[PDB]
């Protein structure tokens, strides 16, 4: 139940999820040989946590993982169906839409979309 679609890139906007849903995959990129590819948000009946840790060289949901030694750009997540992110306007001023609610994953008759 993973969203095979990337969130829409809106001009003058930054998209971030507050809480990541159980099943989310964050790839670990910067290099990091030994092992450790991505991090899985998963846990038992009572808890939620990110499974692995990532090195580098050259409530029902998980909380955003703390930045590691080398990580570029906005993180390339792999979200799950039903995950919701929020857009924020930084220095670009437009707020004709009062109540902010967009970007959710839905299974539209077989294919995932934002």
């Amino acid at each position: 139940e993973l969203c095979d679609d990337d969130p829409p890139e809106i001009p003058h906007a930054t998209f971030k999820a507050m809480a990541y849903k159980e099943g989310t995959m964050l790839n670990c990129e910067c290099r990091i040989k030994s092992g450790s590819l991505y991090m899985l948000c998963t846990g038992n009946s009572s808890h939620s946590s990110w499974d692995n840790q990532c090195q580098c060289t050259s409530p029902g949901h998980c909380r955003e993982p703390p930045p590691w030694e080398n990580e570029a750009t906005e993180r390339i997540y792999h979200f799950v169906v039903g995950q919701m992110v929020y857009y924020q306007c930084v220095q670009g001023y437009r707020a004709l839409h009062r109540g902010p609610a967009e970007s959710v994953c839905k299974m539209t008759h077989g294919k995932t979309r934002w």
Partner: antibody, heavy 115, light 105 residues
């Protein structure tokens, strides 16, 4: 979903390239794993590849034996296998990684290496 | 590098018997997965995150363990269960040696 190439034959010292054609999902967004299984014995992890940026990772046993590549435009993952010996005669599986577990596997490719 | 070891290699069970098979880590792990395989087919997901059954896995199967010691358990053995079970972990992606489960008669 996951269609691998047919049975291969090879001689000792040769190389071989097998394929694994993905279909019905975004080839770019998933890790692709390769797994060896010698006749009778168990499963061995060969390595993985992210076809989005070709970031590969290998089991230490196969560093210089296996080479993992992908062609995004074909939706096909490849594995080349060098200086083949008798101990490479096995069944090779490609599988998609669902994080929790490997959720889909190919039917496998039987490599036989002999003179 | 993390290395899995399974005991036993081969075991027999009469229909109805409780069956238990063990997998132990060389270094601490968070979760343990199990896969099932029958001759002529691919391994199939069976148990993930230590105790969580995959879709279609019978209720007879349960998963247990933590730290460096884990186990798969069948409460009541049925003919359909004869297989090899491989333990597996998502830290370094190594497999156990597998436990082959057969029918005692």
């Amino acid at each position: 979903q996951l269609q691998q190439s047919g049975t291969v034959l090879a001689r000792p010292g040769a190389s071989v390239k097998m394929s694994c054609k993905a279909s019905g999902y975004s080839f770019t967004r998933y890790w692709m794993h390769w797994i060896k299984q010698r006749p009778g014995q168990g499963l061995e992890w060969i390595g993985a590849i992210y076809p989005g940026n070709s970031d590969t990772s290998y089991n230490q046993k196969f560093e210089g034996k296996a080479k993992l590549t992908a062609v995004t435009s074909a939706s096909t993952a490849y594995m080349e296998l060098s200086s083949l010996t008798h101990e490479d005669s096995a069944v090779y599986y490609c599988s998609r990684d669902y994080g929790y577990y490997f959720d889909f596997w190919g039917q496998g490719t039987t490599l036989t290496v002999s003179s | 590098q993390i290395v899995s070891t399974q005991s036993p290699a081969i075991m027999s069970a009469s229909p109805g018997e409780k069956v238990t098979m063990t997998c132990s880590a060389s270094s601490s792990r968070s979760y343990m997965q199990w896969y099932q395989q029958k001759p002529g087919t691919s391994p199939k997901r069976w148990i993930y995150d230590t105790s969580k059954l995959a879709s279609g896995v019978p209720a007879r199967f349960s998963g247990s363990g933590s730290g460096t010691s884990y186990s798969l358990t069948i409460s009541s053995m049925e003919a359909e269960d004869a297989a090899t079970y491989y333990c597996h972990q998502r830290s370094s992606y190594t497999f156990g040696g597998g436990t082959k489960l057969e029918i005692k008669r």
